[PDB]
């Protein structure tokens, strides 16, 4: 499979590495999302691993209903292409910007579905390591999907740990900042931060940005705040909310919710905050979502930010002075077609 087999429809998204497009497979008239990564950008250890693991997790995982599946992979001389399922309900950042705070029942719904996705990855020996509002999409019906798997640790034996300093500063866990080896615990910390954002309407470390001192609007100042400052819960939120946020945002991973090596996920299910959640029905997509995203027109482009969708539908012409400098050897055996 190649670029020939796809009718490019619209630009829908942009990461640091990637440009995202809506595409149609000419063979079947199914529409997919196409992540286009320029090889120009992938140069170090940290960059090749990002693509290789993203591919590996799409294969070995991603069968789950709250994870994005992969149609296929291919390359031109300049770019890597991932063809993945089109999910058209926006992301939780986009949704949070429209409705500044969420009700607790909405936050319960979204965090339950994430928890199942995380637990599924955890039991396949995978740490997500980049949970954030941007990486949690809503589908057309209003259920979540986790998307960006490039940061994942994999091949983790049960009770192993790893050492890499990665993630997103807002969501980074104290273990990582302390320089400790870490396991799945970092994912549960991130969920805590994520749940805080949904219920409170702002990050717990939101002061980092507003200060008169330039040196206190710094990644290093954020990391100091994550480690040493106490996270105050807003008075609005119930006793159950306050408990789960404080339990997930415990600075010690040993004593954090979700992180007992035996009973971790069970402890989450048994928390008063998730009293009335039917976890089997949740996982079978049988709990009616609290919000149905608006889908309009031929493709449902409503919930993608207009800056992306206005941009013209091309792939940028190549510059042969840059393309000739690329090591093609590093992307051999990239091609993949999903065994239908």
């Amino acid at each position: 499979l190649g670029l020939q087999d796809f009718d490019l429809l619209r630009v829908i998204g942009r990461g640091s590495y990637a440009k995202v497009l809506l595409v149609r497979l000419k063979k079947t008239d199914r529409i997919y999302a196409m992540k286009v990564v320029k090889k120009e950008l992938v140069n170090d250890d940290e960059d090749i691993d990002w693509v290789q693991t993203e591919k590996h997790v799409f294969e070995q995982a991603s069968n789950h209903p709250f994870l994005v599946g992969l149609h296929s992979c291919f390359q031109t001389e300049s770019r890597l292409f991932f063809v993945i399922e089109y999910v058209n309900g926006g992301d939780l950042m986009f949704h949070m910007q429209r409705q500044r705070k969420l009700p607790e029942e909405h936050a319960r719904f979204y965090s339950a579905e994430i928890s199942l996705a995380l637990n599924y990855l955890h039991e396949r020996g995978i740490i997500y390591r980049d949970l954030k509002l941007d990486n949690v999409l809503l589908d057309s019906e209003g259920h979540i999907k986790l998307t960006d798997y490039g940061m994942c640790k994999e091949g983790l034996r049960p009770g192993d740990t790893t050492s890499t300093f990665c993630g997103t500063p807002n969501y980074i866990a104290p273990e990582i900042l302390r320089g400790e080896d870490y396991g799945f615990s970092v994912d549960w910390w991130a969920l805590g931060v994520l749940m805080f954002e949904m219920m409170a309407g702002r990050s717990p470390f939101d002061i980092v940005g507003s200060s008169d001192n330039p040196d206190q609007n710094t990644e290093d100042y954020l990391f100091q705040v994550i480690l040493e400052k106490q996270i105050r819960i807003p008075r609005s939120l119930s006793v159950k909310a306050a408990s789960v946020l404080k339990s997930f945002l415990n600075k010690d991973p040993k004593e954090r919710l979700g992180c007992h090596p035996q009973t971790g996920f069970a402890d989450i299910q048994g928390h008063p905050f998730f009293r009335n959640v039917d976890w089997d029905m949740m996982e079978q997509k049988q709990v009616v979502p609290p919000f149905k995203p608006n889908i309009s027109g031929e493709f449902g482009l409503d919930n993608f930010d207009s800056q992306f969708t206005n941009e013209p539908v091309q792939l940028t012409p190549d510059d042969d002075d840059i393309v000739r400098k690329i090591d093609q050897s590093e992307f051999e055996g990239f091609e993949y077609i999903n065994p239908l």
Binding site: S16, W50, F165, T168, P169, R202, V208, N217, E219
Partner: peptide
């Protein structure tokens, strides 16, 4: 916030 919401790796 500041765009300390950007991913990274080291």
């Amino acid at each position: 916030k500041k765009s300390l919401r950007q991913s990274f790796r080291r």
